[PDB]
Design a protein around this nucleic acid. Structure first.
Ligand SMILES: [K+]
Ligand SMILES: [Mg+2]
Ligand SMILES: [Mg+2]
Lengths: 49, 49, 92, 354, 21, 144, 56, 95
RNA sequence: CUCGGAGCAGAACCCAACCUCCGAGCAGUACAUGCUAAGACUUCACCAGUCAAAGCGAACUACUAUACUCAAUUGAUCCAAU
């Protein structure tokens, strides 16, 4: 997907870039995702005490 | 293997069993020239012995 | 049946019921299961060793402060906040 | 080969001829604020929200609650501005704020918040917990009648029920003390349902409590349509939701079909669905108040199963999917010796025919 | 990607004045 | 002679959205290491400061606001000389901490900037939350 | 292949376990005394340089 | 390789192989990584752990190592307290 | 004559000339650059090389923190020293 790119404030290089941009301008970058297919687990009946 | 040999009459449990009786019953094949020092009794099959 | 078992001591009987309440069924029988081996012998030996460990722990009465588990740490914080919400009756 | 954009591209309205004369952000905070705004807008390209955002229905949620109260904004605004002037005029207030020693009375803030923004904050919080999705199949209402449920613990303490705070089954052993503000001659219906307690059916609930035709706010005088049953969350099953739903009856209603035998200790009889119950009584009934808490298993639940319900206690366990390994190959080149353990069922030596 | 309509969505150096030592 | 009450499904269905979160077994959204802020949380405290007001939000990672406290509310505004100073920020923390406990939220992450974290306003708001019972760090997810 | 500015030295644990690790230090600087994790005792212990392995 | 010895007319074993490789009875060969004792001061911990691994050989290498050793080295052995005893037989291997 | 970056080779990967250009054979900071372990990459083989969740042990009370910065910054087997 294409997402808005906000760098870390500790990132000196990237922060200097955005502060010099004209107002109303937003940087974009391509991001890669992984949509989880399976759940973390399932509750199963283990005993009848 | 020990139980199987006894059930078929190939090893006689009414007398003391040793290396000779196991060899004469074709239960185990010992190769002293290949650095075999005898037989090790292993626990496989303990539940049904 | 834990309560009926006379070979265990009475104080030990009463302390095992509290510590291992999760292993006692409706009828009061303490159920122990081991499925870590292929051989019934070793599985039984493990079950018997657990019984011997239960009696040893109850009789020892250890007062040493054990290290808190991670799951327990969160429940401690959650219990604190639940007690913090407790109110008192305006007119008791 | 090129393809024209399907819509307006980012950074398009920026005039690049007057770049030097255009205003810059100059601050990280001003860019972030604009960045957060752009991320929320709909886009014609693929976005994270498309794949991970919950798929809300386009049609708005049907409101089934009481009508909003009518307030005179002009008079309300006048009184509010006057109060601020009086507070700001006090010299002792200014010094306390300047010296950072001032504080607000939390007790008064909650009383005012409960009258003003309380209902909407409770609705927002009820929607987050999934009550409207489960209880009314997505239909939402504003709990405009504050409901105060408290479980008496001991003789001098109370355990208040708010909106998701945890209450243990031991504390909820007996019926709670329910009080709400109601006019004379009105009728109300109060119920308690466990959204997650049901053992056999996933979509069904358990009706722990039902009181009908309550005169005014005298809950004790209501008809016990269903007797009270303490929560019994099963061990290892997680944290359940129990919701108190207050209803405002337009006229006296007959709940003979919903009547449960006293005592009711059959889980089949307790099985209950709020949507079906409200749907049949919707014409003469409106949701007014809402409270709920979160309940997990404790040692007292064993008492409920063994004695009250006369059944064996069901225990559950969170089971994770088995670990994945690629298909075993005859020659696992450059793999460590522990490769073979990954595909081994038992850890004990095997001897085959011998 | 070049052929796709979103080509150039990540461009940013035309929005900044060039830096010359 | 089976007991009707003992009819239990082999798999338990718990529709509580917070169930797995409270067991610390739910997935947190890991990744996003090159951007700010992180997504690896279930709940986060987010403070919005404007020219006239101070607002603090507790929102789930999915973007839903759970609880909120703002100086725009009359319940809070009526007791504040100024809604834009350090006292206002400390008061918002105290009000939010109480509302968090009533909603069942005991843990959240706070993601300040370097200048925000060093500010006296945010330090007083954080102290108010911790004194109120809320812990500003979340427990580690259990994977095993 | 260049001027030898650093040297490799063996740091020996002071716990008496005998666990050693190799570190790089400047030739002109003084002998290193470092606090380094000792696996034998399973906690951080003081190490002291004993010998110079080679010139780097 | 000596296919027919002058004294016995029998195939010989290349002893260089015996000194470097372990043969599991299932047919797999185990070796060490080249350079796992070389210039450790300039290698990272992740790399050094990889170098300490006991790894398997591929099909082509295994076939070559089988040709370079006689049948004696492919027999089933029952050494007492053998560390590699468990790895001699494969389990749940389809093809 | 080995290694890395760029063009040729414009967009997954790969691609030659006694083709066109620029570099490397370190340095600096750590002293948990501790241990261990799923799943993967791979310079077209092999050798070598690369990235890593969880876990143990630490660290921690927000220094873009737990596989340091850096592009290459390098040498197999035997043998020798210990
Ligand atoms: K359920
Ligand atoms: Mg390859
Ligand atoms: Mg890790």
């Amino acid at each position: 997907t294409k997402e808005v790119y906000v760098p870390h404030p500790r990132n000196t290089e990237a922060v200097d870039l955005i502060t010099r941009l004209p107002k109303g301008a937003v940087l974009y970058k391509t991001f890669v995702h992984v949509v989880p297919a399976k759940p973390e687990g399932t509750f199963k009946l283990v005993a009848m005490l | 293997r020990l139980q199987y040999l006894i059930d078929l009459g190939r090893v006689d449990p009414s007398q003391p069993i040793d290396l000779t009786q196991l060899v004469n019953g074709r239960g185990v094949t010992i190769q002293p020239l290949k650095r075999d020092y005898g037989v090790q009794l292993v626990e496989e099959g303990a539940d049904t012995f | 049946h834990l309560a009926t078992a006379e070979w265990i001591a009475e104080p030990v009987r009463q302390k095992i019921a509290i510590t291992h309440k999760n292993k006692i069924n409706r009828l009061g029988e303490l159920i122990l299961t081991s499925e870590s081996s292929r051989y019934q012998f070793r599985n039984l030996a493990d079950c018997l060793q657990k019984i011997r460990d239960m009696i040893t722990e109850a009789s020892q009465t250890p007062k040493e402060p054990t290290k808190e588990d991670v799951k327990l740490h969160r429940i401690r914080i959650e219990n604190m906040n639940r007690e913090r919400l407790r109110q008192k009756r305006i007119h008791s | 080969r090129r393809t024209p954009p399907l819509g307006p591209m980012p950074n398009s309205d920026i005039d690049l001829s007057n770049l030097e004369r255009l205003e810059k952000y100059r601050s990280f905070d001003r860019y972030r604020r604009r960045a957060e705004q752009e991320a929320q807008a709909p886009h014609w390209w693929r976005t994270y929200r498309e794949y991970f955002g919950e798929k809300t229905d386009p049609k708005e949620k049907i409101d089934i609650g009481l009508p909003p109260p009518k307030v005179s904004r002009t008079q309300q605004l006048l009184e509010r501005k006057q109060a601020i002037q009086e507070l700001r005029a006090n010299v002792e207030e200014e010094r306390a704020a300047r010296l950072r020693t001032a504080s607000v009375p939390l007790d008064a803030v909650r009383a005012e918040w409960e009258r003003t923004c309380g209902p909407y904050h409770k609705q927002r919080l009820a929607e987050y917990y999934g009550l409207y999705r489960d209880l009314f199949h997505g239909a939402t209402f504003v709990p405009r009648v504050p409901l105060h449920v408290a479980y008496a613990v001991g003789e001098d303490d109370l355990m208040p029920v708010y909106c998701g705070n945890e209450v243990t089954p031991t504390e909820a052993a007996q019926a709670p003390e329910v009080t709400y503000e109601a006019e004379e001659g009105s009728l109300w219906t109060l119920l308690l349902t466990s959204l997650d307690g049901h053992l056999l059916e996933p979509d069904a609930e358990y009706l722990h409590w039902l009181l009908t035709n309550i005169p005014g706010n005298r809950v004790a005088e209501g008809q016990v349509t269903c007797p009270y049953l303490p929560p019994f969350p099963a061990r290892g099953s997680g944290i359940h939701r129990l919701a108190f739903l207050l209803f405002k009856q337009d006229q006296p209603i007959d709940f003979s079909e919903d009547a449960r035998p006293s005592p009711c200790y059959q889980l089949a009889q307790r099985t209950f669905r709020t949507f079906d119950f409200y749907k049949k009584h919707q014409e003469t009934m409106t949701p007014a108040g809402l409270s709920f808490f979160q309940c997990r298993w404790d040692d007292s639940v064993t008492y409920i199963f063994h004695q009250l319900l006369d059944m064996r206690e069901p225990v559950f366990e969170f089971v994770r999917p088995p670990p994945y390994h690629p298909k075993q190959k005859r020659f696992p080149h450059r793999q460590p010796l522990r490769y073979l353990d990954r595909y081994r069922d038992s850890h004990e030596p095997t001897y085959g025919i011998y | 990607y070049k052929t796709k309509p979103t080509h150039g969505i990540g461009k940013y150096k035309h929005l900044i004045k060039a830096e010359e030592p | 002679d089976p007991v009707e009450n003992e009819a239990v499904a082999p798999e338990f269905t718990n529709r509580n959205p917070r169930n797995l979160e409270l067991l610390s077994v739910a997935r947190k959204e890991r990744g996003w290491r090159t951007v700010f802020p992180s997504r690896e949380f279930w709940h986060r405290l987010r403070v919005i400061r404007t020219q006239h007001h101070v607002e603090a939000l507790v929102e789930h990672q999915n973007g839903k606001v759970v609880v909120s406290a703002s100086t725009r509310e009359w319940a809070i505004k009526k007791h504040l000389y100024s809604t834009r100073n350090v006292v206002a920020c400390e008061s918002i923390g105290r009000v939010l901490a109480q509302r968090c406990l009533e909603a069942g939220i005991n843990f959240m992450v706070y993601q300040p900037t370097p200048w925000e974290a060093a500010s006296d306003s945010m330090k007083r708001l954080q102290s108010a939350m911790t004194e109120g019972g809320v812990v500003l760090r979340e427990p580690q997810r259990i994977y095993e | 292949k260049s001027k030898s500015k650093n040297i490799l030295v063996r740091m020996v644990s002071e716990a008496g376990t005998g666990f050693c690790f190799n570190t790089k230090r400047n030739r002109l600087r003084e002998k290193l005394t470092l606090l380094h994790y000792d696996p034998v005792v399973k906690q951080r212990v003081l190490f002291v340089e004993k010998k110079k392995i080679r010139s780097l | 390789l000596t296919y027919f010895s002058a004294r016995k007319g029998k195939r010989k074993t290349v002893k260089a192989v015996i000194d470097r490789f372990l043969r599991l009875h299932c047919g797999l060969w185990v070796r060490r990584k080249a350079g796992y004792k070389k210039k450790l001061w300039k290698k990272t911990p992740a790399r050094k752990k990889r170098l300490r691994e006991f790894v398997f050989c591929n099909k082509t290498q295994s076939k070559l190592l089988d040709k370079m050793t006689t049948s004696f080295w492919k027999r089933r052995n029952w050494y007492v307290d053998d560390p590699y005893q468990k790895y001699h037989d494969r389990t749940n291997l389809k093809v």
